[PDB]
Design a protein around this nucleic acid. Structure first.
Ligand SMILES: [Mg+2]
Ligand SMILES: [Mg+2]
Ligand SMILES: [Mg+2]
Ligand SMILES: [Mg+2]
Ligand SMILES: [Mg+2]
Ligand SMILES: [Mg+2]
Ligand SMILES: [Mg+2]
Ligand SMILES: [Mg+2]
Ligand SMILES: [Mg+2]
Ligand SMILES: [Mg+2]
Ligand SMILES: [Mg+2]
Ligand SMILES: [Mg+2]
Ligand SMILES: [Mg+2]
Ligand SMILES: [Mg+2]
Ligand SMILES: [Mg+2]
Ligand SMILES: [Mg+2]
Ligand SMILES: [Mg+2]
Ligand SMILES: [Mg+2]
Ligand SMILES: [Mg+2]
Ligand SMILES: [Mg+2]
Ligand SMILES: [Mg+2]
Ligand SMILES: [Mg+2]
Ligand SMILES: [Mg+2]
Ligand SMILES: [Mg+2]
Ligand SMILES: [Mg+2]
Ligand SMILES: [Mg+2]
Ligand SMILES: [Mg+2]
Ligand SMILES: [Mg+2]
Ligand SMILES: [Mg+2]
Ligand SMILES: [Mg+2]
Ligand SMILES: [Mg+2]
Ligand SMILES: [Mg+2]
Lengths: 296, 169, 211, 159
RNA sequence: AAAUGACCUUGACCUAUUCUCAAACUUUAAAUAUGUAAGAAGUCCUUGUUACUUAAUUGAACGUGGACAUUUGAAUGAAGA
RNA sequence: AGAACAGAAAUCUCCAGUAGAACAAAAGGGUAAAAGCCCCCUUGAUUUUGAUUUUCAGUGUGAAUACAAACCAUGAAAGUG
RNA sequence: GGUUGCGGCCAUAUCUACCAGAAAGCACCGUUUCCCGUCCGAUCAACUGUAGUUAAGCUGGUAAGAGCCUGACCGAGUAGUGUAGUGGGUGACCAUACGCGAAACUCAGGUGCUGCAAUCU
């Protein structure tokens, strides 16, 4: 850095470091405190979070609860699972976000026992609804959306995950005003448009409009849609069939591994440098003051 | 080693400091509008001076930041006025550069006495790809030393393309 | 108009500095703490003699200045003004009050009367460095200064080298090999700790393990 | 005139622990309290709500209530020649589970074990605690260690 | 001739040093004092009650039934409490 | 450290920055994706009657804390008020 | 072992300068029809995962490095302090007896450990 900047030892000495996960720019604790903590008179009742994160085009849904030793995953679903259910493209998109949520919804809701009862909306006309408690039966499983550092904006796809997880039978308390199709100057939801996003309508129409306007770009991006021969119209039935596949068998097959833990460890340990002994460190000093010191 | 790191212009920011608010300022504003294609932004005075004749919060000036191909055009268009010769100053240690011109007519822009004549501060901030690390919300980082823009590097960049001169010392 | 110094001899009060809670206090009568040749190099003045207090008491700023003059005056006219380096080791930071005077003992909080240096037993008051050849001269300087002070103080010959913290042989060992480097009136020492880079920029005469 | 307000005199008491300022770590809220639990009271200056009065700083007591953000704590405070019962509403940031009974709980569970293991062999227990006893006799060897003889040392200076 | 000229000059600033200080300064931090605990109102197991609470006969509080006695859980004292 | 008029002080940019600022007011605590600064939506500065802490006689008054029963505000929400 | 998402303790994780990073992942990165936000699609929103890159982020290693953490009959049984005397001293103060006992200093050692889920030559 610059000379007149530097840092005093005095500066470094009194410096209080933030939490590691804040220094990493990952966890927002002000939100986390208020997400996690439980009514003290509910004792060991956990507070489950529906955690949604977007990598550069991969989607992550985990239902997570807290322990002072560390957090605990009840269940997890990623958008890269979607090829199993018949979605090979655009795994980062709104409709993909919906699907994954539904996947996460059915998956845990299954392994809790609430599989059969509480199926949520099977119709998906995109109406605004919460899964209601069943008269004389178990209350539904309750989960709170953890948006992380994502900005809340109306039409954001973090609320896509929310929609499918809600549509999947989970109880995720929410309002309608961040869903695509929310009107600014009147508080009203257009369900026609929200239904359109669930099925990828905004992507299909863009495919349409590039079909005849500019075919230079349509070839660049959407390239893969050509290779498998999928044009716009059929996209609604890709995601419709996806939903049914998910609801039929949510159960989460893992990858086949191939090269066990030991095996990956051996190969990776090659590329990790190792520290030295104080002996080695000392030997370098003495060597240095034989050379740099002793007049060449 | 230079794969990726290039010197893009991050943004160009035009600035006109008018000694007061009212008709003169909104005219300076109209200049930046039709010149930048964007609606400019105006700045209030931070405190009161009275030998400069200004009151705190008075809307003293207007400016605009332009990015993309647009910025290169206005850069070039002003560099022509400066006759493609800058000085060894104008170049910050952090790698940006700027100049200024009286009489905005020297770049395109016909006269129109209902408007009048204004000067401009031109200021160019250079950077490379991967600057997002500093500006993004999540995992906000700082760019590594070798990646950082330096004065030496930007003078060099400025000498090569535009084929202009640095002069001085 | 100064009260007789008998009045302030003992430390009866918690320290009362000049401060934002005080502010009105008068200037110290002793404003210079370094006399003689103060620019001089550590090597030039090996011998060090101290004026050392045997009491726990208070010394007025007036008496420090008075004694400063006394010692410095004697030393120069006898041994020369560049012969020695005199250092007053004690700074009068404690403010003495006074209640000056219809009204009685009512509301008796005093106003600043003057300054005093608080002083321990074994606590050093003056320090002087010279050539060994000058020892008698310096000692007579401190001995005369004594008459300007309340309470008992004694003069002690140091085991150290001038104003350093090292004893005479221990200093030589460090110097006569590599590790001592001049600074204006003082010396810097070579550390085994730290960057090997600029450790050898400074002290280049080391790392020969020789003279 | 004099000033006796609620937080008076509390300057360093409610101060924050050097290089410990800021948000309170999340484990403080993950802890769980039950009626009857024994807690220690220490105020957290960053949390202005639900704060103990300074008198109860460093004081230990028992939980008589559990509520949303807080726990009620009863404390015997002595005023006059007697103790009166005090009931404190405190937020969980100012309360900590006490280890004051830990050794006892440990010592009980260990005592049950030794007692069963004793009965199952036979008798011979001795499970009460005993004070430090004086040392037994011993034989110290001069081999390899012959007494070094020390004298007091003369007066010196080194100033 | 000027210089965003060079060179002396004194100020402030920066760097690494140096002498000395604090009731209303301080990283560190005593001694003396000070809170609680050292069991039968204790520990453990089995599984009832409810309008609280849980995704949930989940938990929370209060219970029924069962297991272990004076080394039953430090010291000293006790013209008793 | 850089930019016409522009100067010690106007407006523009980048870098450094543990808070060295700001939070009506005295001071002291406290606070950094806030408790500070800019914006959006608001009236919980509301309704009912008890318990509690400081001062204490364990009276009153002031101020405050944690719940219960309402009606509301805000936020995607947990929450918060 | 690596990596990611959510974490616990919150510098042995911070800071300054260099160098190295397989595979995967993260990343940077392309685009502006759509929801959405801007003086500026830079941030923010969406779309593609295609067109490109390990340069930066990120991970690790180096340094008689700064800071930080730990230890020691290092200093020091020192400073301070509870109890005692018809002890010393004009006094200021100071020794002694039965106890408790620091901080600085100095030297040595160290430079994140770890929970849940997923993935990877
Ligand atoms: Mg230093
Ligand atoms: Mg902080
Ligand atoms: Mg938030
Ligand atoms: Mg490259
Ligand atoms: Mg003007
Ligand atoms: Mg006294
Ligand atoms: Mg009088
Ligand atoms: Mg007065
Ligand atoms: Mg005398
Ligand atoms: Mg007072
Ligand atoms: Mg309040
Ligand atoms: Mg002192
Ligand atoms: Mg103090
Ligand atoms: Mg006691
Ligand atoms: Mg007993
Ligand atoms: Mg008895
Ligand atoms: Mg009896
Ligand atoms: Mg204040
Ligand atoms: Mg925050
Ligand atoms: Mg009111
Ligand atoms: Mg009173
Ligand atoms: Mg009464
Ligand atoms: Mg009052
Ligand atoms: Mg790769
Ligand atoms: Mg975005
Ligand atoms: Mg690299
Ligand atoms: Mg990263
Ligand atoms: Mg070091
Ligand atoms: Mg002593
Ligand atoms: Mg004592
Ligand atoms: Mg006596
Ligand atoms: Mg003593």
């Amino acid at each position: 850095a610059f000379q007149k900047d530097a840092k005093s030892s005095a500066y470094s000495s009194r410096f209080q470091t933030p939490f590691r996960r804040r220094r990493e720019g990952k966890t927002d604790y002000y939100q986390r405190k208020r997400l996690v903590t439980q009514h003290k008179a509910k004792y060991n009742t956990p507070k489950y979070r529906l955690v949604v994160r977007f990598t550069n085009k991969d989607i992550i849904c985990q239902i997570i609860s807290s322990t002072i030793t560390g957090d605990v995953v009840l269940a997890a679903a990623y958008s890269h699972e979607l090829p199993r259910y018949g979605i090979t493209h655009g795994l980062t998109n709104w409709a993909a976000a919906y699907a994954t949520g539904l996947l996460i919804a059915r998956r845990t809701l299954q392994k809790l026992g609430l599989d059969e009862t509480y199926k949520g909306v099977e119709e998906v006309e995109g109406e605004y609804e919460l899964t209601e408690a069943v008269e004389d039966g178990p209350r539904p499983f309750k989960v709170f959306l953890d948006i992380g550092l994502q900005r809340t904006t109306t039409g954001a796809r973090v609320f896509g995950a929310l929609k499918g997880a809600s549509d999947g039978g989970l109880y995720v308390p929410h309002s309608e005003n961040r869903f695509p199709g929310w009107d600014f100057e009147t508080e009203e939801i257009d369900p026609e448009l929200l239904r359109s996003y669930i099925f990828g309508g905004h992507v299909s129409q863009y495919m349409e409009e590039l079909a005849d306007d500019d075919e230079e770009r349509f070839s660049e991006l959407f390239k893969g849609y050509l290779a498998d021969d999928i044009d716009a119209d059929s996209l609604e039935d890709i995601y419709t069939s996806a939903h049914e596949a998910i609801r039929a068998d949510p159960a989460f097959k893992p990858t086949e591994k191939k090269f066990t833990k030991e095996q990956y460890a051996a190969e990776s340990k090659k590329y990790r440098q190792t520290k030295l002994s104080k002996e080695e460190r000392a030997a370098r000093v003495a060597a240095k003051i034989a050379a740099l010191a002793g007049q060449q | 080693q230079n794969p990726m790191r290039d010197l893009k212009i991050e943004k160009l920011v035009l600035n006109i400091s008018v000694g007061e608010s009212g008709d003169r300022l909104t005219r300076a504003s109209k200049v930046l509008e039709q010149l930048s294609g964007q609606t400019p932004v105006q700045s209030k005075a931070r405190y009161t001076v009275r030998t400069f004749g200004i009151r705190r919060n008075e809307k003293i000036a207007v400016h605009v930041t332009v990015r993309g191909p647009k910025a290169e055009e206005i850069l070039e268009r002003g560099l022509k006025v400066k006759e493609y010769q800058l000085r060894d100053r104008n170049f910050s240690a952090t790698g940006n550069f700027g100049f200024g011109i009286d009489e905005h007519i020297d770049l395109g822009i016909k006269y129109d006495p209902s408007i009048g004549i204004f000067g401009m501060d031109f200021y160019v901030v250079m950077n490379r790809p991967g600057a997002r690390v500093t500006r993004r919300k999540r995992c906000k980082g700082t760019v590594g030393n070798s990646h950082k823009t330096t004065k030496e590097d930007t003078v060099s960049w400025f000498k090569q393309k535009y084929d202009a001169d640095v002069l001085d010392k | 108009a100064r009260r007789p110094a008998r009045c302030y001899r003992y430390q009866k009060n918690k320290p009362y500095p000049k401060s934002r809670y005080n502010r009105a206090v008068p200037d110290s009568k002793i404003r210079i703490y370094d006399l003689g040749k103060k620019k001089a190099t550590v090597d030039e003045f090996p011998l060090c003699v101290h004026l050392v207090s045997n009491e726990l008491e208070q010394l007025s700023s007036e008496a420090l200045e008075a004694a400063r003059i006394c010692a410095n005056k004697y030393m120069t006219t006898v041994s020369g003004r560049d012969a020695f380096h005199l250092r007053v080791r004690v700074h009068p930071f404690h403010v003495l009050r006074i209640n000056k005077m219809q009204q009685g003992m009512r509301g008796a909080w005093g106003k600043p009367h003057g300054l005093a240096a608080r002083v321990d037993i074994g606590q050093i008051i003056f320090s002087v460095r010279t050539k060994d050849s000058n020892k008698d001269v310096v000692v007579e300087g401190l001995r005369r200064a004594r008459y300007k002070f309340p309470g008992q103080q004694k003069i002690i010959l140091s085991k150290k080298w001038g104003f350093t913290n090292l004893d005479r042989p221990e200093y030589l060992k460090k110097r006569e090999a590599g590790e001592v480097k001049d600074d204006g009136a003082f010396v810097k020492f070579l550390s085994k700790k730290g960057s090997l880079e600029n450790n050898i920029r400074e002290f280049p005469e080391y790392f020969a393990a020789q003279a | 005139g004099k000033s006796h307000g609620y937080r008076s005199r509390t300057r360093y008491m409610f101060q924050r622990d050097f290089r410990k300022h800021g948000a309170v770590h999340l484990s403080t809220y993950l802890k769980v309290y039950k009626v009857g639990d024994i807690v220690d009271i220490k105020a957290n200056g960053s949390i202005q709500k639900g704060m103990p009065h300074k008198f109860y700083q460093g004081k230990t007591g028992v939980v008589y209530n559990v509520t949303k953000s807080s726990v009620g704590v009863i404390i015997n405070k002595m005023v006059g020649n007697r103790y009166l019962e005090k009931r404190l509403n405190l937020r969980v940031e100012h309360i900590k589970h006490s280890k004051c009974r830990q050794e006892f709980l440990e010592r009980v569970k260990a005592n049950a074990a030794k007692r069963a293991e004793a009965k199952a062999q036979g008798v011979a227990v001795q499970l009460k605690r005993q004070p430090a006893q004086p040392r037994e006799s011993r034989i110290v060897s001069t081999e390899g260690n012959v007494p070094q003889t020390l004298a007091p040392v003369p007066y010196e200076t080194f100033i």
